Amino acid sequence: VSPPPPIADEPLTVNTGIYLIECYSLDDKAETFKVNAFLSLSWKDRRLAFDPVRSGVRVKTYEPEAIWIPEIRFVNVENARDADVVDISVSPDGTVQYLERFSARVLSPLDFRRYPFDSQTLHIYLIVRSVDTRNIVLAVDLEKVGKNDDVFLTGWDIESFTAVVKPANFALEDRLESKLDYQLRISRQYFSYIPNIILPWLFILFISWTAFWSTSYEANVTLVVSTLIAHIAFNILVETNLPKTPYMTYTGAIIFMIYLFYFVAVIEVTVQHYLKVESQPARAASITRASRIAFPVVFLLANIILAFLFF
Amino acid sequence: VSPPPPIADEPLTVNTGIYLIECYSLDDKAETFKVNAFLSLSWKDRRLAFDPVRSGVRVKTYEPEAIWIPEIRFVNVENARDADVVDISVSPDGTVQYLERFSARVLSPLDFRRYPFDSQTLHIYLIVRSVDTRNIVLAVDLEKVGKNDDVFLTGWDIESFTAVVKPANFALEDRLESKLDYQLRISRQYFSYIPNIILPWLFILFISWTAFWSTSYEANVTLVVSTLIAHIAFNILVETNLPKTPYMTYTGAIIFMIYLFYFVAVIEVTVQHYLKVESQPARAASITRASRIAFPVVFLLANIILAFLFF
Amino acid sequence: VSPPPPIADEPLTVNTGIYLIECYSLDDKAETFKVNAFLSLSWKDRRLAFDPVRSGVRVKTYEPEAIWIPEIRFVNVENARDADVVDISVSPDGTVQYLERFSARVLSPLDFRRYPFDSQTLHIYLIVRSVDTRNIVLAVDLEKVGKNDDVFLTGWDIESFTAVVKPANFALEDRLESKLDYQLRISRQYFSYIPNIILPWLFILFISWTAFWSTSYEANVTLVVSTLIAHIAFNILVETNLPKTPYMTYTGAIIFMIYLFYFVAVIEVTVQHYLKVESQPARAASITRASRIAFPVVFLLANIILAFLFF
Amino acid sequence: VSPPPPIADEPLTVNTGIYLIECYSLDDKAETFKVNAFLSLSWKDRRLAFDPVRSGVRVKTYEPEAIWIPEIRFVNVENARDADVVDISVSPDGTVQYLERFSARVLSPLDFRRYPFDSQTLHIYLIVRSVDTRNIVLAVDLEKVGKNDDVFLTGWDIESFTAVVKPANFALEDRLESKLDYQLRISRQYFSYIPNIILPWLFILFISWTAFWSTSYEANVTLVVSTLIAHIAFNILVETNLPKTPYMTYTGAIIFMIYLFYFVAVIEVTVQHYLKVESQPARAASITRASRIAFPVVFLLANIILAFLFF
Amino acid sequence: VSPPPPIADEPLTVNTGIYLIECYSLDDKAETFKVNAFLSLSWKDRRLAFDPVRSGVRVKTYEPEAIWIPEIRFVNVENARDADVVDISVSPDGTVQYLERFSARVLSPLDFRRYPFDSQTLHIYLIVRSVDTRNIVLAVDLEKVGKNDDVFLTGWDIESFTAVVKPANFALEDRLESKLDYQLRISRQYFSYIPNIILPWLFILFISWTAFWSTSYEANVTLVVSTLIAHIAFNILVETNLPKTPYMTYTGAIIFMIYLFYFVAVIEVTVQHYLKVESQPARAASITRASRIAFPVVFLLANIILAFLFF
Numbered sequence A, B, C, D, E: 001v002s003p004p005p006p007i008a009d010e011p012l013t014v015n016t017g018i019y020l021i022e023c024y025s026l027d028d029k030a031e032t033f034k035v036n037a038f039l040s041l042s043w044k045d046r047r048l049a050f051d052p053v054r055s056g057v058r059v060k061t062y063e064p065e066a067i068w069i070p071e072i073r074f075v076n077v078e079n080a081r082d083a084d085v086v087d088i089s090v091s092p093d094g095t096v097q098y099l100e101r102f103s104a105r106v107l108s109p110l111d112f113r114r115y116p117f118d119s120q121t122l123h124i125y126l127i128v129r130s131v132d133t134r135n136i137v138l139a140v141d142l143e144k145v146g147k148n149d150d151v152f153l154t155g156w157d158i159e160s161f162t163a164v165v166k167p168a169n170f171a172l173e174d175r176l177e178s179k180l181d182y183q184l185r186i187s188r189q190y191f192s193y194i195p196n197i198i199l200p201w202l203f204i205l206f207i208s209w210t211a212f213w214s215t216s217y218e219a220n221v222t223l224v225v226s227t228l229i230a231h232i233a234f235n236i237l238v239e240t241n242l243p244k245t246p247y248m249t250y251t252g253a254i255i256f257m258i259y260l261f262y263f264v265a266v267i268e269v270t271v272q273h274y275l276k277v278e279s280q281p282a283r284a285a286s287i288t289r290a291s292r293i294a295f296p297v298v299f300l301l302a303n304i305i306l307a308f309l310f311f
């Protein structure tokens, strides 16, 4: 078994297609996702051509070892895919129709800049290395590219599964390589984040701001310092589901900003008490009254600036 | 080895059966469950027929490679099942009786809307792709569908294991596909949730309401703020065992509602103190006395509304 | 290769034996344990009989594929065992002596009712399905059932490894099945639980009871509320190592009872303060003095009732 | 392929040798370690002897299937080792020189009594079961026992890798078994424990003792109760990296002792307050002044007693 | 199949090359990284020489089993690599051009002394053991050493992937071994650490220093003790992502130093209160005023000393 020889000196076109059966385990920290799909391959092998009238059979079924099959691999995989050959069909002209069902863990990077209001473009890169006798080029058979309706990815909305029809043909270690880009467009379901993380986080922050309606330093210390512990808990809970990014994220910016607001609240609480002890509560009262308006206003304006910069 | 030819142009019926031996590892967050079961297959292959008289044997045993066996796969699996062929028996008329024992991780989504008082319908989808020569259709042999009495799923009550007898026959990549729906009905054992989560959660909430029988702002701050830390702990403990849902859950609604009640309690504690400092405790006392009745009543009524909406 | 034919119409007896080499990874939450052992099988195959005088050999060694070997499987396993055939020996009468070394993850449920003073009976179920030509029945060769001296299961004391000699012979999917019960008796090492969990838990509970020797509401609130946070930490630490049970456990009952005692302590602390503020400390003093005796007495009596109900 | 027959009656000596290439993943909780090493085997097979003159080759290379190779297994492994045969060489006299490269997870118990100032003796048990025709005995070829210089075990110092030259020959299921003990001596690197765990733990304990220089019950309660929460955190952090032992550990005793010191400190704080409320601060002052000396002295003496009992 | 014989007593040179396709999962605690790459091998085997005129092909393709292939292994791997042979090409002279695509978990130690501002030199060691008949030596084909542009390692910047061209030829167990060092230079992306860990950690430390502007012992105790709980949380969060090192790390030194600063702050808070109770606030005021300047100055100077010692 060797590659089919060229009629003239044209490269061998292998038509490809991926049909998603299952999409699961999207690990944000690891930037990986598991996929279970059909991989369809089609090429012309004139050595396998037959007469349909004399053979009496329209199609001829073959075992993988019986014929030449192109070595198609995935670029962005952890380990080589687990494949099960479903069917091999040969038409009278020698056109081969290969079909396998595979499962693979795909390495595809994510952009956390807009998290949890982010959309991602997941990639599946198909590749073929050219042999010495002839060069192999990949193609997209749009009729064999898709996903089943039941394909669900927990916490995500699946937009589209398409392929960039033009392959990236490049030289690697003195041989030609034909690469195809299969793109899975997904957008994060941000609903849950509001009553589970966003609203409870704002509530604990508003609790610290009740210290602006109190002169009791011991109670104010308790209010601001204790809610800071809850803020630290929410910060840790959020950052454990996210990887360390070399760029600032929308959530990252907000979290950092809340740390500043807590620090400024501690300063206010310290200043108010110092002036009270220094027998000048009229100065303390004016600062505290200003803080009641300043803190929510500056917080609301800063969040508008952040939302604008990130979206 | 190729599929058995048709007598007349009828499709090939493959009778199926699944008998559950072991049911384990129901991962709520991952929405997966592990299953160890018997898979029985039966089809007529006239090429394998024999005369029981001249053969001297009523049945003929074959090795998988010796005969044609239909390529049956599972739709909603992570990876292809781990199968061990138990027995292959051929009757004189050519009826084949296949039996294998498999283990597989099944991807089946869960509805957490009523958690932890929820019931689930787990699915196992059997499938067969039609070949060139003839079309393969699946069937349910009710006599070979079941589960053993010992089959236990930790934290769940197993109701029934049945199959939808009518297959979903559809075209996929220019070939016919026959799909069967095996349904495992289960209901969650909610007992443990009451003394472990529900009752302790209500106790910490009632402790915060003792601030309505105190005028001591420092003590009230301590009571409401510290019990909030415990509520955050319980919130985190519960949400780690649940996936992020694009819908509101019964538990989710309650958790969120408790965050509102804590926020309103902080407001009351802030108001009571402000009026006390403003030398008007008669106003503070009337608000605090009203809160003693209002807080449990509104909490009890809101929970009735939530139980009604979710159930 | 087919099963040995019967002399007269008796079933085929396969003598079994399991000898434990390694016992490890007892997962309480998962209710599973890993086992590495020898599996010995013995049956009579008269087709393999030979004369020892003319053959000059007392024993004949065979490869697995050369002869018929019964398909023995485990019922309560996650996946099919990882076996390595050690030896196959045939005696002159045709008695086959099979030996393999296997490793398997066993699914065996645990009774947490008396945890951590619980004992468990772990099970390993051996099974054989009867073939069409003849029926296969399992037996226990007591001389080939055991465990090595070094077999250690971390945090457990291994009592005995025995087998119920009488097999459970039953019909399943119109064929006979012979099941054997191998029982591994173990008891939990409860030593560590006393200085690590029990005594520190009682200490934090006793710290809350020091509030019955104080009139300072702010200090009492701090004492009872802060130790409740520690009580929650211990509750979470314990329940993470245990699965969700549909029955009440000994530890579960105690944990729940401590939550009641904390709630009653908050009520006492609230009542004592209210009466003091209401300018009647004589009533508060009598309640507080009674609580000093009542709380440890009721706690000690309730624990006696719980220990009696559970043991 | 069968074992080499004896010249006289003597057993077959298989010379063994393990050369460690990689040592990693020492799991304390699981009491396991991963090893990647060379396994060398040598035995005389006279059936393979050749004349170096007639053959023209001083050595003969064989494939595993071509010749008889003894079935050598590891006793204390989770699953059977993953082996790759490197070389098989036969000398003219028939001496076979086998070499394989393996990887295996080894089950070896640890003694936590002196943790984190503990040393361990890890074990690798080589074994061979005697066949029907002749008995196989293991031996140690000291020239082929070693480890490479780069072999590093994270958080441990590797002392020596030696083997007990005399095998443990015993009967198991009526056949002889020859066992060899390969010992890997390691000692824990306790450096990190001092500035990371020990010193910070003493600091939080000393902070609780500052309550002996204060008469403020509310501040004292805060000091002793809050540092207890930190002590609980450190207790949990330490015990999660350790398995549940049926014996007391050095660390375990200290941890338990600190819980006693916290309880006694709460008693002192309770007593001091009661006497001051009872209008007798002279009694309270004498107890508090004594506690300032008593607490560090009794703590220092008790630790000397513990270090003496454990080392 | 045996090694190619020498023309003139020279060793067999195997030209090697590694081309990285995917780099992922750099586990700091485990000191391992996963790699998916191309492994190219080239050696002369004159026994495979052919005349393209007689064979009708300029290059011959072979299956791995058909010809002799050198046994190349990796030194610092957990388990043997998962390899898929891509192509084997033989030119008329008998020069073999082998290509495989492998995936492997590599054991490479890291130096955490400068963490999180550290750079690492990851290693991949290629090795070949010499056979009886002739000695095998490794070489680096620089044209076949590289990495693709998309190769991304989460949280790291990939500097270079080069190989030490001169192999380390040494004797091991009576046979020659040729080792090659493939070096992957990486540097940690320290950006995220500043707003996520560094700045929030400094904020909680500055909050404790507000106790130097207060005379309220109860408030000061709350400020210093509560922020210590947050400092413990940050310490635990950081040390869980790092292994236990026998050397002091830059982060380790800082963490330890913060524990000292908290202890000294508790001493100051204790001293200030004692003098105030001893009716000498003039002494307490002078210490507290000095602490306001001393604490940030000594902290800033000590950090300069630490940064200097570590960088």
Ligand SMILES: CCCCCCCC(=O)OC[C@H](COP(=O)(O)OCC[N+](C)(C)C)OC(=O)CCCCCCC
Residues within 6 Å of the ligand: A117, A194, A198, A199, A254, A303, A307, A311
């Ligand atoms: C403390 C901060 C609170 C969070 C505030 C909400 C943040 C926000 O502005 O989210 C916007 C987001 C919609 O994202 P998209 O519209 O999908 O982003 C693409 C936008 N373009 C192409 C124009 C650049 O999602 C929404 O539509 C917002 C709905 C959630 C409202 C939450 C209220 C608390």
Ligand SMILES: CCCCCCCC(=O)OC[C@H](COP(=O)(O)OCC[N+](C)(C)C)OC(=O)CCCCCCC
Residues within 6 Å of the ligand: B114, B117, B190, B194, B197, B198, B199, B201, B202, B254, B303, B307, B308, B309, B310, B311
């Ligand atoms: C943490 C805050 C919890 C406070 C509320 C406590 C009561 C509680 O939650 O549980 C009620 C729940 C039963 O309600 P559901 O059966 O789940 O209602 C279904 C709605 N339909 C069927 C009409 C579509 O479950 C039960 O089994 C009720 C018994 C609970 C007993 C404990 C005291 C609540």
Ligand SMILES: CCCCCCCC(=O)OC[C@H](COP(=O)(O)OCC[N+](C)(C)C)OC(=O)CCCCCCC
Residues within 6 Å of the ligand: C117, C194, C198, C199, C254, C303, C307, C311
């Ligand atoms: C706050 C609660 C503290 C716990 C109190 C101890 C609980 C207790 O009584 O445990 C009993 C247990 C022995 O169990 P077993 O004897 O193994 O159970 C079999 C019992 N029968 C007779 C029915 C067949 O174990 C013992 O022997 C008890 C040893 C532990 C003592 C701990 C003291 C703090």
Ligand SMILES: CCCCCCCC(=O)OC[C@H](COP(=O)(O)OCC[N+](C)(C)C)OC(=O)CCCCCCC
Residues within 6 Å of the ligand: D117, D190, D194, D198, D199, D254, D303, D307, D311
């Ligand atoms: C609160 C408890 C504080 C900890 C006190 C230190 C514990 C201690 O004494 O450790 C001793 C240990 C050395 O152990 P080894 O010498 O390795 O054990 C063998 C001992 N023989 C053979 C003689 C019986 O290690 C040492 O050499 C001591 C180094 C640690 C110093 C810690 C200072 C805080």
Ligand SMILES: CCCCCCCC(=O)OC[C@H](COP(=O)(O)OCC[N+](C)(C)C)OC(=O)CCCCCCC
Residues within 6 Å of the ligand: E117, E190, E194, E198, E199, E254, E303, E307, E311
């Ligand atoms: C409480 C402690 C605060 C942390 C202080 C910052 C630590 C620091 O100085 O980090 C230096 C680091 C750059 O290191 P490198 O230049 O990459 O290391 C090589 C240096 N030589 C070869 C000269 C020895 O990284 C930087 O360039 C520093 C950027 C981070 C600034 C953080 C401000 C909060």
Ligand SMILES: CCCCCCCCCCCC
Residues within 6 Å of the ligand: none
């Ligand atoms: C408390 C924060 C409320 C702010 C809500 C902003 C929602 C923006 C939606 C923009 C859709 C394009």
Ligand SMILES: CCCCCCCCCCCC
Residues within 6 Å of the ligand: A229, A230, A232, A233, A236, A237, A240, B236, B240, E229, E230, E233
């Ligand atoms: C005061 C800081 C407490 C931080 C607690 C974080 C809890 C994280 C749990 C994450 C489980 C997935």
Ligand SMILES: CCCCCCCCCCCC
Residues within 6 Å of the ligand: A229, A230, A233, B229, B230, B232, B233, B234, B236, B237, B240, C236, C240
């Ligand atoms: C306010 C601090 C809340 C911390 C809660 C931590 C809960 C972690 C649960 C982990 C279970 C796996």
Ligand SMILES: CCCCCCCCCCCC
Residues within 6 Å of the ligand: none
């Ligand atoms: C159909 C069964 C409904 C049972 C409802 C029980 C509700 C109990 C609420 C108690 C709240 C503390």
Ligand SMILES: CCCCCCCCCCCC
Residues within 6 Å of the ligand: none
């Ligand atoms: C502090 C609680 C002490 C209770 C000890 C009970 C021990 C029961 C032993 C029963 C053995 C049969």
Ligand SMILES: CCCCCCCCCCCC
Residues within 6 Å of the ligand: A229, B229, C229, D229
């Ligand atoms: C008073 C604050 C208590 C915070 C305890 C947090 C515990 C976090 C556990 C996280 C386990 C991963």
Ligand SMILES: CCCCCCCCCCCC
Residues within 6 Å of the ligand: B229, B230, B233, C229, C232, C233, C234, C236, C237, C240, D236, D240
């Ligand atoms: C209210 C604070 C509760 C803290 C819970 C700590 C749980 C730690 C679990 C650690 C599991 C390894």
Ligand SMILES: CCCCCCCCCCCC
Residues within 6 Å of the ligand: none
């Ligand atoms: C703060 C505790 C310091 C105790 C140090 C003990 C060091 C013992 C060294 C023993 C070497 C054999």
Ligand SMILES: CCCCCCCCCCCC
Residues within 6 Å of the ligand: C229, C230, C233, D229, D232, D233, D236, D237, D240, E236, E240
């Ligand atoms: C009361 C505070 C308990 C804190 C327990 C913290 C547990 C941390 C475990 C982290 C494992 C990675």
Ligand SMILES: CCCCCCCCCCCC
Residues within 6 Å of the ligand: none
């Ligand atoms: C608050 C700490 C600020 C210190 C920043 C130091 C940055 C040093 C940069 C050195 C680059 C070589």
Ligand SMILES: CCCCCCCCCCCC
Residues within 6 Å of the ligand: A236, A240, D229, D230, D233, E229, E232, E233, E234, E236, E237, E240
């Ligand atoms: C009282 C201090 C509690 C500190 C707990 C820190 C928990 C960190 C958990 C991080 C899990 C990735």
